[PDB]
């Protein structure tokens, strides 16, 4: 059917530049304009600019002019947005969406899955896991809580299983947080009845693809 395909997420050092691809299919690429939207993490959607693939005319949000550059390749039916002089601010998911007209009103009906661009000078380093020992003699109640600490790592994402994919209840993997060290940090917990604490062997499985770090800790 009709759909748009964007290149994969990328990590680049500040002051550098990136070219994001958005190849269309399922329709006559030159028959529609392409819209580029940016979504900073946690923030909302922000229109960047537009391009007419037939004659190559562009129009940018007065604030992204001279930072982003739109181009198309009719031969391969692909749009291209280039960001240059990257900075921390430039960290966001970038979306390309197909344009559509209805009585002068322009709305975007088909969106690409988006491309994440992370601007950091960190280095693709592996994660460390420091057990979050349950209790210190707190029992009294019925339920207990444990957890694993994945301190310092880069980039995202990281996988955190428990007792090898067969333990899904109570699990609570929290979103990673970026430290000033430029590195990341995440935590994973598994609520478990105290009566099992002594009869069960809990092991949180971590899997960081970037640095190929598979760590198995027994809490």
């Amino acid at each position: 059917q009709v759909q748009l395909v964007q290149s994969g997420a990328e990590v680049k050092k500040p002051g550098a530049s990136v070219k994001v691809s958005c190849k269309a299919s399922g329709y006559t690429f030159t028959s529609y304009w392409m819209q580029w939207v940016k979504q900073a993490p946690g923030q909302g959607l922000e229109w960047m600019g537009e391009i007419d693939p037939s004659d190559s005319y562009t129009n940018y949000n007065q604030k992204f002019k001279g930072k982003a550059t739109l181009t198309v390749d009719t031969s391969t039916s692909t749009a291209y947005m280039e960001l240059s002089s990257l900075r921390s601010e430039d960290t966001a998911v970038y979306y390309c969406a197909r344009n559509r007209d209805y009585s002068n009103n322009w709305y975007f009906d088909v969106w690409g899955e988006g491309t994440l661009v992370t601007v950091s000078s960190a280095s693709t380093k592996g994660p460390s896991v420091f057990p979050l020992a349950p209790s210190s003699k707190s029992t009294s109640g019925g339920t207990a809580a444990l957890g694993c600490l994945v301190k310092d790592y880069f980039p995202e994402p990281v996988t955190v299983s428990w007792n090898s994919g067969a333990l899904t209840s109570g699990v609570h993997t929290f979103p990673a947080v970026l430290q000033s060290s430029g590195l990341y940090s995440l935590s994973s917990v598994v609520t478990v009845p105290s009566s099992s604490l002594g009869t069960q062997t809990y092991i949180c499985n971590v899997n960081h693809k970037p640095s190929n770090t598979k760590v198995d800790k027994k809490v």
Binding site: W47, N61, Y102, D109, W111, G112, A145, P175
Partner: protein, 214 residues
């Protein structure tokens, strides 16, 4: 530029309920019954989805419970009945003047019954106390609403301000939340005090809870 203001910032309703979110423009985005306001829906870690265009035209695949109204500068999207798939973020957007601007967004949340959070604290593991750093975690299990407040108190009254919060999304079954604040301090700074407590403040809590160790 035309500025769109959506409200309420957040909206907690229960399944089956009728929602009504409004989008206000700092200037008219119309002309002879011709409108330039569209709405989009966006789920966590997902691309926006066109809902309505030209202020009131349903897009293919958009149920009949959705409907958009409005004129000049005041517009509203309504959902007669909220279905499980309807809980997400909604964005109104203008296309009347360049640059095209979006709205801040309105998060429709699943309103449920208050739940007191289960609090937990964790002293720095040993391996970590080797690397030279110390991170004390204070868990806050399945609670509602999302509004809570953790207070770190080293050696009593000495409440610091060097932690990092992380809240979980609404659960896919009990619509609850989980929060974990983390206090990081050098091993030396750690081995200098004795009492480390994490004071929680929640509506579900009769009185602020506290969890300390030595």
């Amino acid at each position: 530029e035309i500025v769109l203001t959506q409200s309420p910032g957040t909206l907690s309703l229960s399944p089956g309920e009728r929602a009504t979110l409004s989008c206000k423009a700092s200037q008219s985005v119309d002309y002879d019954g011709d409108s330039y306001m569209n709405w989009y829906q966006q789920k966590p870690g997902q691309a926006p989805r066109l809902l309505i265009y030209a202020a009131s035209n349903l897009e293919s695949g958009i149920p009949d419970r959705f409907s958009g109204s409005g004129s000049g500068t005041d517009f509203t999207l309504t959902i007669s009945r909220l279905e499980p798939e309807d809980f997400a973020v909604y964005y109104c957007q203008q296309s009347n003047e360049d640059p095209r601007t979006f709205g801040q967004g309105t998060k429709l949340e699943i309103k449920r019954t208050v739940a007191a959070p289960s609090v937990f604290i964790f002293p720095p593991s040993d391996e970590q106390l080797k690397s030279g750093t110390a991170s004390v975690v204070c868990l806050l299990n399945n609670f509602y609403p999302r509004e809570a407040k953790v207070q770190w108190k080293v050696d009593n009254a000495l409440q610091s301000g060097n932690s990092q919060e992380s809240v979980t999304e609404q659960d896919s079954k009990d619509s609850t939340y989980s929060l974990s604040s983390t206090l990081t301090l050098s091993k030396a700074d750690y081995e200098k005090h004795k009492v480390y407590a994490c004071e929680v403040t929640h509506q579900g809590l009769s009185s602020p809870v506290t969890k300390s160790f030595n």
